[PDB]
Structure 1
Amino acid sequence: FLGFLGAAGSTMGAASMTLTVQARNLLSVWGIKQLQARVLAVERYLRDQQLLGIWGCSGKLICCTNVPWNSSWSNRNLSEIWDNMTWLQWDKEISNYTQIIYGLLEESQNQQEKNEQDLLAL
């Protein structure tokens, strides 16, 4: 056990076994200021959980999806990503490709929603 953000400097493979530690800490003059800090924490948490549900990843911490990895985003191989890079370094590399990936996941699930809707119709 490392603690909150303990694996920030750890490799992506090693830091992915402690996702629960960071996940559980995202939810919980000194009056309204302290009260609006709690409402901001809930709204920030709820819009992240909404994104997971839209991508079909609701209730999951590691969600393998159907969107293929465009090599333009990152040409590195798996060995030097999950064993040589940390999540802070990785976020810097793909910070500009984040929004195009988010749209790809959003539409891919929307296609899967109608694909399973038609399969159940038979």
Structure 2
Amino acid sequence: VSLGFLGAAGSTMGAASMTLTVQARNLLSHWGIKQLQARVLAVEHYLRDQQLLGIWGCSGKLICCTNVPWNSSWSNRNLSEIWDNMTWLQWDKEISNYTQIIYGLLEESQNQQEKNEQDLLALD
């Protein structure tokens, strides 16, 4: 039985990644003007990262797979003591400089490589 909205935010990173559909459904659902400045503000924060997934190749998935190698100067740690001994609210603080480099490296070296590979592979 699933817990609910923001339900596993104290759990470890290995267990909270299973129930990711709950935080995705409930993200979009003279004083009516304050109601109207909320329904426009809700739809424009959602279109921003929906744009930002569409350029990374992750068009409609939730666990999507990419191809850049991990530099290991961003986080020294192993595989095992990340997915079992940390929470998501604590991992997002340690990597937190190190993220305007990833968002640049994630799209430039991949969708400007893959689409210029298939246009040079499907010639035949």
Length-normalised TM-score, structure 2: 0.88
CA contact (8 A) 1:8 1:86 kept: yes
Give the C-alpha shift of residue 47 in structure 1: 0.8
> 16-25 or 111-120: which moved more?
111-120
Show the counterpart of 2:34: 33
Shift of 1:110: 2.5
* Matched-pair identity in %: 98
Which whole-Å CA distance do the structure 1 matches of 2:30 and 2:5 have between them? 28
What are structure 2's unaligned runs of at least 5 residues? none
1:103-122 pair list within 5 angstroms? 103-122=104-123
Normalised TM-score (structure 1): 0.89
- 8 A contact 1:27–1:41 mirrored in 2: yes
Shift of 1:20: 0.8
Give yes or no for contact 1:54–1:109 (8 Å, CA) kept in 2.
no
Question: Do 1:4 and 1:21's aligned partners in 2 also have CA atoms closer than 8 Å?
Answer: yes
1:17 CA drift (Å): 0.6
1:5-49 per-position Cα deviation (integer Å, ceiling 9, x unaligned): 111111111111111111112111741212221211111111111
Q: Could you tell me how far apart the structure 2 residues matched to 1:77 and 1:29 are? A: 57
Q: Distance in 1 between matches of 2:101 and 2:34?
A: 35
Aligned-partner SS, 1:17:
coil
| Structure in which a larger fraction of residues adopt helix | 1
Q: Unmatched 5+ residue regions in structure 1?
A: none
Pair member with larger Rg: 2
Kept after mapping to 2: 8 A contact 1:8/1:15: yes
Q: 1:16 to 1:30 in 2, by over 3 A?
A: farther
